Amino acid sequence: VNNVWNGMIGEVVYQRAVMAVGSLTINEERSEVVDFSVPFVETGISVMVSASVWVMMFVMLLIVSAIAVFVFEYFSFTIGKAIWLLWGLVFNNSVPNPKGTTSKIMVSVWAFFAVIFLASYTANLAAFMIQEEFVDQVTGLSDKKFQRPHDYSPPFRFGTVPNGSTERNIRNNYPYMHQYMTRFNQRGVEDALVSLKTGKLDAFIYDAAVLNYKAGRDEGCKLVTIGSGYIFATTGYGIALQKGSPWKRQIDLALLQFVGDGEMEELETLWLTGICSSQLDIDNMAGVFYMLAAAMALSLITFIW
Amino acid sequence: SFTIGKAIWLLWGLVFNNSVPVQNPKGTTSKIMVSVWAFFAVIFLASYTANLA
Amino acid sequence: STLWLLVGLSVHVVAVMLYLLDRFSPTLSSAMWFSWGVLLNFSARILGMVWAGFAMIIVASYTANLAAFLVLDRPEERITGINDPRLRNPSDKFIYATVKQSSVDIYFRRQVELSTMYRHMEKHNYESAAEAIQAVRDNKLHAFIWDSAVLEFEASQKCDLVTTGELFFRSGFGIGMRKDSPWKQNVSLSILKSHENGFMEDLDKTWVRYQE
Amino acid sequence: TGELFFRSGFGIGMRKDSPWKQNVSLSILKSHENGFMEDLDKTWVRYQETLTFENMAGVFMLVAGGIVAGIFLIFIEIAYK
Amino acid sequence: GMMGELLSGQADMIVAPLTINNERAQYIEFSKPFKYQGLTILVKK
Ligand SMILES: *[C@@H]1O[C@H](CO)[C@@H](O)[C@H](O)[C@H]1NC(C)=O
Ligand SMILES: *[C@@H]1O[C@H](CO)[C@@H](O)[C@H](O)[C@H]1NC(C)=O
Ligand SMILES: *[C@@H]1O[C@H](CO)[C@@H](O)[C@H](O)[C@H]1NC(C)=O
Ligand SMILES: N[C@@H](CCC(=O)O)C(=O)O
Numbered sequence A: 001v002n003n004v005w006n007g008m009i010g011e012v013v014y015q016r017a018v019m020a021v022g023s024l025t026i027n028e029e030r031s032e033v034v035d036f037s038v039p040f041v042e043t044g045i046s047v048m049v050s051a052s053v054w055v056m057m058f059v060m061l062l063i064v065s066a067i068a069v070f071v072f073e074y075f076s077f078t079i080g081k082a083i084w085l086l087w088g089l090v091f092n093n094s095v096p097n098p099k100g101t102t103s104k105i106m107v108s109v110w111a112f113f114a115v116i117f118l119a120s121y122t123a124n125l126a127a128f129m130i131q132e133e134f135v136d137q138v139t140g141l142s143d144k145k146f147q148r149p150h151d152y153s154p155p156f157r158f159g160t161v162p163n164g165s166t167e168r169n170i171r172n173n174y175p176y177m178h179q180y181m182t183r184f185n186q187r188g189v190e191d192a193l194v195s196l197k198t199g200k201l202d203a204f205i206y207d208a209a210v211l212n213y214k215a216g217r218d219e220g221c222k223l224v225t226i227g228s229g230y231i232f233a234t235t236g237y238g239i240a241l242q243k244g245s246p247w248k249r250q251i252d253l254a255l256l257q258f259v260g261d262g263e264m265e266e267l268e269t270l271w272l273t274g275i276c277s278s279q280l281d282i283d284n285m286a287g288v289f290y291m292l293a294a295a296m297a298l299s300l301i302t303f304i305w
Numbered sequence B: 001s002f003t004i005g006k007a008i009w010l011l012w013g014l015v016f017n018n019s020v021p022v023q024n025p026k027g028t029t030s031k032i033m034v035s036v037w038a039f040f041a042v043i044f045l046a047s048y049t050a051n052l053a
Numbered sequence C: 001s002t003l004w005l006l007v008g009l010s011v012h013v014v015a016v017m018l019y020l021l022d023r024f025s026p027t028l029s030s031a032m033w034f035s036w037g038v039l040l041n042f043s044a045r046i047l048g049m050v051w052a053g054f055a056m057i058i059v060a061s062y063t064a065n066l067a068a069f070l071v072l073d074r075p076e077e078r079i080t081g082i083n084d085p086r087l088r089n090p091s092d093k094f095i096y097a098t099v100k101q102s103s104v105d106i107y108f109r110r111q112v113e114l115s116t117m118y119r120h121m122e123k124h125n126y127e128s129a130a131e132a133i134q135a136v137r138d139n140k141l142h143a144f145i146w147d148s149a150v151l152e153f154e155a156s157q158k159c160d161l162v163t164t165g166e167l168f169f170r171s172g173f174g175i176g177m178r179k180d181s182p183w184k185q186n187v188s189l190s191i192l193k194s195h196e197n198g199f200m201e202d203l204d205k206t207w208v209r210y211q212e
Numbered sequence D: 001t002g003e004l005f006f007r008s009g010f011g012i013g014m015r016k017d018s019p020w021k022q023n024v025s026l027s028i029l030k031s032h033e034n035g036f037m038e039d040l041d042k043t044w045v046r047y048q049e050t051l052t053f054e055n056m057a058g059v060f061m062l063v064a065g066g067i068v069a070g071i072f073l074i075f076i077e078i079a080y081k
Numbered sequence E: 001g002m003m004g005e006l007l008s009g010q011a012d013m014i015v016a017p018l019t020i021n022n023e024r025a026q027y028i029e030f031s032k033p034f035k036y037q038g039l040t041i042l043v044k045k
Helices: A007-013 A028-033 A052-074 A082-090 A101-130 A165-173 A175-184 A189-198 A209-216 A248-259 A263-271 A282-303 B007-016 B028-052 C002-024 C028-040 C043-071 C103-110 C112-121 C129-137 C148-157 C185-196 C199-209 D022-033 D036-046 D057-080 E002-008 E022-027
Strands: A045-049 A203-207 D005-013 E014-019 E036-039
Touching (some): A028 D022, A045 A209, A052 A082, A052 A101, A082 A101, A082 C043, A101 C043, A101 D057, A165 A175, A189 A203, A189 A209, A203 A209, A248 A263, A248 E022, B007 B028, B028 C043, C002 C028, C002 C043, C185 C199, D022 D036
Antiparallel strands (some): D005 E014, D005 E036
16 A cells, blocks of 8 residues: 555565565565565465267067068058057056067067166166256356456346455456446455355355365365366465575474375365265256157147148 | 956056956946056056065 | 156046057047056057157166165265264264263273364263163163273163274273282283183073073 | 365475576466466467267167067067968 | 486576475475376276
């Protein structure tokens, strides 16, 4: 503020302290006024929000129909209804009777094939049930929706806490984003999180380690970040020092020594807990609706004839 | 015509639901009861498969 | 479920449209009973068979989702020992208690790293283990920490209760004495001999191993 | 596989105390904080380059062979009659 | 290797995927990272 610093950088530059232990990113202006040690935890900035099978079956069904026609030629009303009977017996619906030996053998073999196919379909259903996915609305800071919310049909809201490295970087990178963002400058992480629940706000832009921890220890697991994260300005945390301080070399070597033998991993496990239903068939029901719409369209087409 | 003593075979076959030709149903109450019992047999075999798993 | 009612409405609509198609095609109760026999198990026959295939796929999907509902999403009423973060950071929901002024209290107080648990438990410490078991049986408690032998015997006696998996702070039971006393060496040797032969096995069979 | 252990970085090595150190580090930071590393990742690294036929291909082939055998048996029966 | 070449005077700068660790950092001065990563295992499937 007018060539005046404040906070931890303010206390370090003006010789009221020798180092600043707390969480503190690395960027150009701070590296110009002080000296940072090697990073020991990486934090960027991220976003927090709340075909031929049928053809071959048809070919085999045509083969079955031709076999049934041959059986009828050799030795009653199942000429054009052979396909109807076969596909009715596929699902074992007991629709209101084969007589020829070859026809019975073919029907039995195709029934066994339908049984193994339905077993495979049950296995596929089990695999689909095992598979679980989340939904991500925003792809990145340069997403199409983020381009201009007013242009988009819903004027969704997204904000960050001001007076930070994140705000400074967004200002330097994209002015229009900052212009729109100014309206929702919600202060504090804890106060910020609540508006996300209530829906007054839609997206949240902050560090990555903080958001990872706050998603990890959230009760109910409602809020989820987007993809891996660190989607920009991938930076780390440092220990600030005065310019030319003789502690820099020793502190760098000690931090590297700690990182190189798993002690940092032990600390991360101890102090950061990263964890990780109901029936739904929306896609299946939509597909069934499309198929029945096609069927009724076909019936209407055949209505004239 | 003969479902007085031969209904046991029909019911037992429809317990397993193997589409075995047993007898052609005619009574409405019998058909509804057989359909409900077939649904019960289907859910029972589903529970048996879950028990096997 | 609600989806089941929606499917019922859909099959009723399909039956109605099949009846209309039958009327338009150049009888009533027969078609109704055919729909009754099909939905549960020549233009309209194609629609009927396709809808039968839909019904088979729907019952298969319902079987799969009910199997998932009965297998996977099972509440974890257990705690799996001290390594539960829900007990690392407690609340007013999970109430785990112990007997006031016993070995467990000393063990938890000695380790400073369990200061959160030590502060949490001090509100619910009970006078006796019988009272604690009675309170948890009256659905007042959620967890209880005590010796393995007593808890296993109580679980065998009363089948409604179940123990957890983790086993920590393994120790033994001793016979206290004064300080240096004449009755020490002989008592210890008697205990060792009783272990090596079959007497402790007999005692465990008669008092602890038996099942009610 | 899954696990990711011994997380470290990549550096541009130099001599010991050398006049080209602080400027190189500041240039790396300035390239990080804007989109240059993203452009490089796009061009070089980020750029990217059931079936029901596993346990049923042999089954289908054997079924076709059995169908051919049944056709031959039908021909044999026709010749017999 | 590259570190021996750099120390012996045959080169002035190493531009390559060089990892940062204690043994190397004791003798040469790295810059700040331009790529964050770890280690993993490759299998054939
Ligand atoms: C901190 O943010 C508030 C709110 O926008 C602003 O009034 C104040 O000037 C900021 N202070 C600094 C030092 O950036
Ligand atoms: C039992 O104790 C007596 C002394 O009280 C001692 O003389 C004797 O040896 C002991 N028995 C043993 C060691 O078996
Ligand atoms: C490197 O940065 C420093 C900043 O203190 C500047 O004085 C110097 O001129 C820069 N290097 C060169 C070669 O200009
Ligand atoms: N730890 C970060 C937080 C950034 C922010 O709050 O926007 C910093 O001090 O720069």
